[PDB]
Amino acid sequence: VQEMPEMAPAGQLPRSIDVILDDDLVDKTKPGDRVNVVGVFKSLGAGGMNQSNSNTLIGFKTLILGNTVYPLHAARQMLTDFDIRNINKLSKKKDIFDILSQSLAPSIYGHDHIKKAILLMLMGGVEKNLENGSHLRGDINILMVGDPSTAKSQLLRFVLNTASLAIATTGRGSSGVGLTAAVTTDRETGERRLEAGAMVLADRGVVCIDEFDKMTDVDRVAIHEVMEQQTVTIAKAGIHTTLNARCSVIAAANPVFGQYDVNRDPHQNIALPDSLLSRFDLLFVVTDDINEIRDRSISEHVLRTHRVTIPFLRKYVQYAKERVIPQLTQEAINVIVKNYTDLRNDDNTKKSPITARTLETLIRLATAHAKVRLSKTVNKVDAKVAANLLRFALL
Amino acid sequence: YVHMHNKQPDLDFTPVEPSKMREYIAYAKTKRPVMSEAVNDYVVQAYIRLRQDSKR
Amino acid sequence: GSRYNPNLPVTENIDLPPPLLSRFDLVYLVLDKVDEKNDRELAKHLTNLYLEVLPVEFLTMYISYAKEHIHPIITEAAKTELVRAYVGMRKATTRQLESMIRLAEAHAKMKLKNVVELEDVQEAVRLIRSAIKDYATQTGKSVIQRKLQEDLSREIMNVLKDQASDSMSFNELIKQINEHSQDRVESSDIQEALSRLQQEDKVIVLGEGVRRSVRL
Amino acid sequence: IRGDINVCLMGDPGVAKSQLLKAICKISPRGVYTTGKGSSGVGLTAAVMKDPVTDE
DNA sequence: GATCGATCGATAAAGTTTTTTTT
DNA sequence: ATCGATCGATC
Ligand SMILES: Nc1ncnc2c1ncn2[C@@H]1O[C@H](COP(=O)(O)OP(=O)(O)OP(=O)(O)O)[C@@H](O)[C@H]1O
């Protein structure tokens, strides 16, 4: 067990001790859980007075033989009839998608296209696996880019506080993002194990990494396979193993040539390989133009921050991750194909060309949008938010 | 249409098991026909018909 | 690119050190054309060879006996015609003229395995005649160099004459020099025109831009 | 002489066309599939590598 | 002096991701 | 923990 690296004041790296448990609580702790344990303290082994020549060698391995491993949250969220009925009463209004948007980040103005996109992504959409067939990309993977110091990196880390067991990395240039590279450490003298780097934690969770263009070539081939394919398989020095992972990235990058996002090609703009650009959908370009009422309003909201709520918000999504999935309305599927074929003929006569897989977005956004409604019917109103959200991402 | 059901019933074709033509490929593999002489009397100038248009 | 690019110098296609061109005695290309009397005939070959002494090792023991037993001598009867070729040749110098004997020996060593033959050189000169049919139209050629350097010399002198200082900026030299004559290329003569003239007390390099020229 | 001609494709759809080729390759006899990573060109042919404690 | 029995001492372990200049 | 070698005691 490491140290929780926030209440340990920085004068040292995190230390560690270890614990031997028994049969009742095995396979209970995933790597990356805020665990709480309590047991006896115990030394064992012989040391210092063994037969000869044990000079300056410690001989008391500190161990813990313990019980009652407790997870904490700072899956266990119990709720009575009262609070479960309030969210039924808070499923009633025709505005709750708009109230939940601005009730998320109470420090930054605007970007309601962005502020709806995060909550739409974080709750996530379903993947109906094909019987004797390849399932499709039931995850969702959004991307941002912006001219610098426009809070493009601010909102990426407060999703980690309400993560619901989604611990992300920071994107450091190392191989191990989704692999092991045969790290075994002999597994107590003679056993070889494939200890997972960062995909045993991302399963049914979210990750976020920074500085996409500011990497070497190793991660570029690494995010190639693990996006088009749900899993990874490797025999580094051992055996092939197809371990699965349901994950979804959150990206961030910066344009290189300063303030050039208007005078040049809007595409080919950062020239990281467009296989990833094709495998992502939403490429928001954050604008920061000068409006004299905008910055004036900005100047006070940075002053009133030196002093409908969060735990109700996280309970809502982690209850709405376990309910029904409609997928079906024979006329809501009719309006969207009219809503695509026009811009399928208005893709080259505009800025961005689209592809056929973009149609699978247009169901998937509205699929989770009905999950906000908590209803077993695909409605009609979902095919209007999915339209104009793309219309801002494309115009 | 593929998301309403969990199948692809389309294109009005009676689907065939892949073992059938797998045998027919193996059944064709027990034939190996030998060419006649009428073919190369005509394809010799078909190459000539393929000659000047690329050289045009 | 695609071919052996005729009505061009064929040497500039194959990017190659011009020393090692001299490290081959005779070269030959192949030919290609529409060629309606021959490609029709070549189709008749592949029309056949598909439907329905020429040994394989018996000739190999025939040569691998002979290539170490017979070491033939040369008589005067070859050297009289041999000097007649070179006195007509000068109407390269010696490298082409040396190794022809190294192949004229082997043709005599092939059949008449005692001595040289006085007339098998008369088709040995035919094979290397085919080598010098391939360079009628750098590597071994100086016409282009002569046409270029003289032209380069005029303009530089005029530019030097034109100013109190030696200010020849980049925006000037892309203008008038390019305008001059359209016999030289547009941009593939704007780099190498100064590096040979760097060593001859004329100019200096200060990036893709300003420069500094010769004073007197 | 040569047999067994080789046909190549090109083009950039958004359909992820591996299902349009390699689904045939997963039912065709003796049709093995590969990708970019893993088996390189030296890893295409055979090689000598590390093995377990048995015959390396 | 030789042979047998008992006691004491010595003998067995394993590797293959980060980082440097360099082409 | 097991095997081998050396030393001591007994016949
Ligand atoms: N558009 C904005 N509206 C309100 N506050 C902002 C905005 N942009 C920046 N800020 C303020 O800036 C602070 C931190 O910004 P941040 O460091 O996230 O920029 P950034 O996204 O890291 O830029 P970059 O990623 O290019 O370095 C926050 O406290 C936030 O209040």
Q: How do strand A243-244 and strand C211-212 relate by DSSP bridges?
A: unpaired
Q: At what angle do helices A382-394 and A358-373 cross, to 10 degrees?
A: 130
CA A42 to C1' E17, whole Å: 35
Distance between first and last Cα of chain A: 50
Question: Which nucleotide in the DNA or RNA is closest to residue A236, CA to C1'?
Answer: E16
DSSP H or E stretch at residue C205: strand C204-205
Whole-Å CA distances, A80 to A9, A63, A76, A77, A83: 39, 40, 13, 10, 6
* Exp. method: cryo-EM
Question: Which nucleotide in the DNA or RNA is closest to residue A186, CA to C1'?
Answer: E14
Q: At what angle do helices A382-394 and A332-344 cross, to 10 degrees?
A: 20
Judge contact between C194 and C213, C-beta under 8 A: no
Question: Nearest-CA neighbor of A141 among A208, A231, A219, A222?
Answer: A208
Q: Check B3 against A330: CB less than 8 A apart.
A: no
The Cα–Cα gap between A247 and A213 comes to 21
Judge contact between A133 and A115, C-beta under 8 A: no
Distance between first and last Cα of chain B: 48
- In the numeric block, the tokens 């969702």 are attached to A140
- In the numeric block, the tokens 């391939």 are attached to C134
Q: How do strand A283-286 and strand A143-146 relate by DSSP bridges?
A: parallel
Query: Residue C7 corresponds to which amino acid?
Result: N
D26 DSSP 8-state letter: T
Residue C115's beta-bridge partner residues?
C73
Question: Nearest-CA neighbor of C123 among C110, C136, C114, C140?
Answer: C110
Judge contact between A227 and A251, C-beta under 8 A: no
Whole-Å CA distances, C125 to B1, C26, C96, C110, C119: 79, 11, 11, 17, 10
Q: Check C51 against B35: CB less than 8 A apart.
A: yes
C-alpha A12: how far from chain center: 30
Judge contact between A178 and A231, C-beta under 8 A: no
One-letter-per-residue 3-state SS of A159-214:
CCCCCCCCCCCCCCCCCCCCCCCCCCHHHCCCCCCCCCCCCCCCCCCCCCCCCCCC
Q: Which two tokens stand for residue A265?
A: 């090609």
Q: What is the C-alpha radius of gyration for chain B, rounded to an integer number of angstroms?
A: 22
Residue A145's beta-bridge partner residues?
A253, A285
Q: Check B44 against C40: CB less than 8 A apart.
A: yes
C-alpha A144: how far from chain center: 14
Question: Nearest-CA neighbor of A219 among A288, A280, A173?
Answer: A173
Deposited resolution, Å: 3.9
Whole-Å CA distances, C80 to A281, A371, C74, C97, C121: 84, 103, 12, 14, 11
The Cα–Cα gap between A333 and C172 comes to 65
**What residues in D contact B25, CB-CB < 8 Å?**
29
Q: How do strand A231-232 and strand C204-205 relate by DSSP bridges?
A: unpaired
Burial (CB < 10 A; 0-12, 13-18, 19+), residue A103, is middle
Q: Which of C37, C51, C52 to mutate to test the interface with B (most CBs of B within 10 A)?
A: C51
Residue A250's beta-bridge partner residues?
A142
Burial (CB < 10 A; 0-12, 13-18, 19+), residue C1, is exposed
- What's the half-sphere exposure (Cβ side, CA atoms, 13 Å) at A61? 9
Judge contact between A326 and A370, C-beta under 8 A: yes
The Cα–Cα gap between A237 and D51 comes to 9
**Cα dihedral value A44, A49, A53, A55, nearest 10:** 70
Question: Nearest-CA neighbor of A242 among A178, A184, A185, A187?
Answer: A178
DSSP string, A61-79: EEEEEEEEEEE--------
Q: Which chains does chain A touch, 3 or more C-beta pairs < 8 A?
A: B, D
Query: Residue D23 corresponds to which amino acid?
Result: A
Q: Which chains does chain D touch, 3 or more C-beta pairs < 8 A?
A: A, B
The Cα–Cα gap between A136 and A127 comes to 7
Question: Nearest-CA neighbor of A219 among A167, A273, A264?
Answer: A273
Ligand 1 site, CB within 6 A: A 107-109, 148-154, 254, 302
Q: What is the C-alpha radius of gyration for chain D, rounded to an integer number of angstroms?
A: 16
Q: Report phi then psi at B24, rounded to 5.
A: -70, -30
> Between chain A and chain C, are at least 3 CB pairs below 8 A?
no
Judge contact between C30 and C148, C-beta under 8 A: no
The total number of residues shown for chain A amounts to 395
> Between chain D and chain A, are at least 3 CB pairs below 8 A?
yes
Count the neighbouring beta carbons within 10 Å of the beta carbon of residue C68.
7
Q: Ligand 1 mean position to A295 CA, how many Å?
A: 14
Shortest-distance Cα residue to atom 25 of ligand 1? A153
The Cα–Cα gap between A257 and A237 comes to 43
| Nearest CB neighbour to A278, from listed D14, D19, D36 | D14
The Cα–Cα gap between A39 and A53 comes to 34
Give the nearest ligand 1 atom to A154 CA: 18
Q: What is the C-alpha radius of gyration for chain C, rounded to an integer number of angstroms?
A: 28
Residue A244's beta-bridge partner residues?
A231
Q: Which two tokens stand for residue D1?
A: 């002489």
Protein chain D, residues 33-52, with a C-beta closer than 7 Å to any atom of nucleic acid strand E: 50
